[PDB]
Design a protein around this nucleic acid. Structure first.
Length: 145
DNA sequence: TCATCGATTC
DNA sequence: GAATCGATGA
């Protein structure tokens, strides 16, 4: 029912994902980590996704908060975009440091809206879009390794 | 039963 | 500041 991200040696990570169109945006959904060991490889999987996107010649993405709570309470897609600008930049740092910046933006969301001060979980259900990519085969090669 | 993120530990 | 745990309400 769910696809998974695979590591560099072809081993399945504990990181459920899906490829398709959600709220009019085509890309990769990374499922949330929790409770306990549910999708506990979230951060490792996201580091791999960022590394492979960069290796594939992708420099910028758009990332939306896609939790059931935020989809319900925040109707505006532009408000669900986690980063302030049009795009999030993947180049100019290690995949881990890019990932830390990306996931820091998740801390600005509550169940019902934005916070002024960031706090809490940074391993939420997210939708990652590559502008001009509408094909599952591109995303299949990112999560496969 | 379940994904949610606040809360706690790192 | 960030990884992990686990109380919570649907």
């Amino acid at each position: 029912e769910f696809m998974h991200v695979f590591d560099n040696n072809g081993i399945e990570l504990k990181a459920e994902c899906s490829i398709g169109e959600e709220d009019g945006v085509y890309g990769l959904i990374l499922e949330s980590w929790g409770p306990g060991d549910r999708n506990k490889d979230y951060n490792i999987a996201l580091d791999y996704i960022i590394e492979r996107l960069v290796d594939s010649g992708v420099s910028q993405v758009v990332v939306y908060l896609a939790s059931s709570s935020v989809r319900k309470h925040m109707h505006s897609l532009d408000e669900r975009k986690i980063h302030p600008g049009e795009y999030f930049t993947l180049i100019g740092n290690s995949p881990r440091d890019i990932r830390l910046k990306m996931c820091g933006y998740q801390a600005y969301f509550s169940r019902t809206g934005r916070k002024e001060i960031p706090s809490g979980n940074r391993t939420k259900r997210i939708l990652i879009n590559v502008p001009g990519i509408y094909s599952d085969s591109f995303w299949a090669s990112i999560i496969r390794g």
